[PDB]
Design a protein around this ligand. Structure first.
Ligand SMILES: CC(=O)SCCNC(=O)CCNC(=O)[C@H](O)C(C)(C)COP(=O)(O)OP(=O)(O)OC[C@H]1O[C@@H](n2cnc3c(N)ncnc32)[C@H](O)[C@@H]1OP(=O)(O)O
Length: 102
């Protein structure tokens, strides 16, 4: 362990002791032009402070709004996080047509 600093990698964000010993890692990719897709998101269950995932997603959303990027997630985990945080449903394509859930 060292510090919970947001480490940047190959189009990804992670926090941990080392690249391999990452506590929380979130990856994204540019599918078209300004749309970033989040498919992989893994956090250590045997940690305790699982709130790190919130900061990781927040950092992506915050930066997305700055460059007017569009957020899309194939990751069932990250997607649900965006569903929870209505505040992130501005850059995230959560507004398709039906909304809510049903
Ligand atoms: C679909 C994916 O990419 S996840 C599977 C791939 N991941 C890997 O390679 C490693 C596997 N390990 C993991 O990913 C971990 O077990 C995790 C990330 C799934 C566990 O999640 P946590 O780090 O505990 O996140 P945690 O739930 O505590 O907090 C973030 C949000 O996740 C949401 N969440 C919890 N469970 C789920 C779930 N089963 N599916 C979607 N979202 C969930 C919660 O709403 C939570 O929000 P809250 O803090 O307001 O309550």
């Amino acid at each position: 362990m060292s510090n919970l600093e947001i480490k940047q990698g190959e189009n990804k964000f992670y926090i941990g002791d080392d690249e391999n010993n990452a506590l929380a890692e979130i990856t994204y990719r540019f599918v078209d032009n300004n749309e970033i897709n989040i498919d992989h998101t893994g956090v250590s269950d045997e940690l305790g402070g699982q709130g790190v995932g919130k900061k990781l997603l927040k950092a992506v959303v915050e930066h997305a709004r700055e460059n007017n990027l569009k957020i899309i997630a194939s990751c069932s985990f990250a997607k649900h996080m965006l569903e929870k945080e209505d505040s992130y449903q501005d850059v995230y394509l959560g507004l398709e047509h039906h909304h809510h859930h049903h």
